[PDB]
Design a protein around this nucleic acid. Sequence first.
DNA 1: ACCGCTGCAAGGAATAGGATACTTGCGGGCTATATGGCGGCGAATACCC
Length: 97
Amino acid sequence: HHQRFNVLVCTTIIETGIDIPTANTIIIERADHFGLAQLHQLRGRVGRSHHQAYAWLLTPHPKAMTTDAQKRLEAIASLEDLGAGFALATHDLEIRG
DNA sequence: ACCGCTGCAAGGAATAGGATACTTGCGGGCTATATGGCGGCGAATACCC
């Protein structure tokens, strides 16, 4: 809240989100196993300000990726705009079933 | 000599992956209703006395 330290390493407790407008960038390390809902939620958790945020996504080797991980990543990359969570939920329907 | 604490299991949300019950086509193994040929002849009816 006082922003005395800049970057925080954390597990998925960050997912609920208490985002501060100061935070404007998220870098992940594991991109092979994460649900689309979590991906979009952590994407949109940033912001609450006028300043252009960012979402840097780090992936291990493409060949280490299973088919489903490729589908999730290509789907999340395909859509990037406001009002994207609901449509992504519609797509997740027929995916998770 | 009593207590609040740490810590160590039990039960919820997200992914990969083999086992294994289930379904199917077969291969061999078995059982069980006609219509263009005559001629001769002898027996068997039919007949009308």
